[PDB]
Amino acid sequence: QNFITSKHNIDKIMTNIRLNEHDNIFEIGSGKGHFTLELVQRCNFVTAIEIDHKLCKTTENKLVDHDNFQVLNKDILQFKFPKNQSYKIFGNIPYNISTDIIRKIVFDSIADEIYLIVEYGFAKRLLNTKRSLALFLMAEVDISILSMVPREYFHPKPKVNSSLIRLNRKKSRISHKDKQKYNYFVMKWVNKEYKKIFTKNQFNNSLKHAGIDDLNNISFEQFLSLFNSYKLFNK
Template sequence: MLRHLPKSLPKMPNGAFGLKMAKFRPKKKLGQAFLTYPPIADQLVTALSLSPEDEVLEIGSGKGILTERLVQKAKYVYAVEIDKRLVLQLKEKLAQYQNLEIINQDILTYDLAGLPRIKIIGNIPYSVSSQIIFYLLRNRNFWDIAVLTLQKEFAERILAKPGTKEYGALTVIFNLYTEAKKLFNIPPAYFKPKPKVLSTAVLIKSRSEPLFQVADEAFFARVVKQAFSQRRKTLLNNLHASLRIDKDELQRLGIDLTRRAETLTLAEFVVLSERLQGLIKSA
């Protein structure tokens, strides 16, 4: 937990680069909100547990508050930034570092296949949080650990437990492939411009193997999403409507389908998916 946070922020650095950054106007469509408080940046980088042999992918390098710390600890840093204005300024600011590549690209189109196994860090734009999480899941074989700053409500969704209102399809699919824990909350005052909500830093570890073996991962994801498609309806009604399977057939699966999706554990969803697939194949 963060303790004894000061009420005021440190002043911006002097010099040409500081003036450029001070005059920088964020683009609302990119959801830009830049971390400004150095001690929080220190804690985020520390949470990555970097060694001199580690290579790091930074999602959205922004004004470089994390980047300048990463290049001093990691073997190599790939800083992906969608805003060309920031890329040009960061190349000027961090020109002395030979272990840094600043890439002007949308992270969702960036191919990790050519990189060594990496660690990941980033302050994630709230508007694309889901897309980035699923991007990381698709590329889970290329990274070990990620430290992400997310909107608090979104972080609660990936950390949720069964039976809670935050628990959903994202939670289930995410937990099959990764494990996560909350690090700390970050107040709006430590970003510029200030977001309207709290942020939460989360540590995510990619599992070497899925927590449970699933024969068809695409079908599993489809079942989970359909089960949550209308939260107030039972599993029986949601699965009947989406999979077009007769209700009498579904009730022979040996699973209580009068329950709602948010009451099922990950293990129960795996069993449900496997039995549904067997039912479809035997039809």
């Protein structure tokens, strides 16, 4: 399924993407040379990553008269992203893409932007409140559907589709300062344990101030309001 190769699609989806030849990026998955090639000439440098040795050789060649190399073959989860130079990230790892890779990628790198095709269903998984994962990512990165990946641009596996997503950061809050506090909150909130967050004197105006009715459908923004109220309550 490690497909999706065919320069015409790999040009049509790169279409809406904002990489250029000033960007150094990380190829989270390798695939089968397909993408690590379209980018090597599109961005400055590239550093792919896929563990099994075979694949790297595959890539290794599909990239000649092209020296923007680096096709390391280690466990991404274990990978140490740079914490100095600025860069982006791309990964055609739908099917193989977990949440642990999405975390490495988002909370453990200073990657400015993260583009990645993911099963469309995995998108909401990241796009819905009352789902910590989302409430956590949304505090720094901005998740958005950029494109879709209809037909079998890959091979089979439908039941569903893939879809291109962009994760772009903002300096934004949720100050490391109060970040253990934001996690509790996120934790307790999604766990419906509002009894640990604020008191009922609070669970109310808080909701009323965030202008929250469908409490079962928050808007992060509202969750934001909440955390803030919470943050400034003391009983």
